[PDB]
Amino acid sequence: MRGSEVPQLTDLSFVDITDSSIGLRWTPLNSSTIIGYRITVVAAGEGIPIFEDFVDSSVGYYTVTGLEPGIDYDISVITLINGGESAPTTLTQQT
């Protein structure tokens, strides 16, 4: 990219990091027209994908499920606004 361009969820971070889901927090972007935020998961270590889930447009709190413990997961949470995607801020975390 170049520096940053589209504003990204600069407070995107993870909580309730149990073996049975992973709970997210970020700030809700009432921009005007945002499509949503798209979470994706992979098993961090490979590009083995799991699923991409979507939320409304107005969420500040979500919880991903469909994990299995033992491996690390790169939980990506891409914001997609008016004709533009923010910088990907994933976090690597184990289960």
Side-chain angles (χ1 to χ4, degrees):
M1 82 282 259
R2 63 192 159 215
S4 51
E5 230 188 276
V6 173
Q8 75 204 81
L9 292 166
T10 310
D11 78 309
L12 181 285
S13 303
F14 302 173
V15 276
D16 205 90
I17 312 179
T18 189
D19 319 337
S20 73
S21 34
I22 223 269
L24 303 116
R25 295 173 176 186
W26 64 77
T27 292
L29 315 181
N30 280 277
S31 270
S32 46
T33 258
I34 201 186
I35 299 98
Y37 326 84
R38 173 272 233 107
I39 288 76
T40 296
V41 241
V42 321
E46 189 159 40
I48 275 190
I50 278 88
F51 68 80
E52 96 220 85
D53 184 321
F54 240 103
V55 256
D56 200 89
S57 52
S58 64
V59 170
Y61 194 81
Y62 166 55
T63 297
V64 207
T65 331
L67 253 156
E68 203 190 298
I71 310 296
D72 194 301
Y73 274 58
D74 263 322
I75 315 103
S76 314
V77 183
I78 289 195
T79 299
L80 36 144
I81 87 167
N82 169 81
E85 184 196 85
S86 331
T89 317
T90 294
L91 262 165
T92 312
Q93 208 71 77
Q94 214 185 11
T95 309

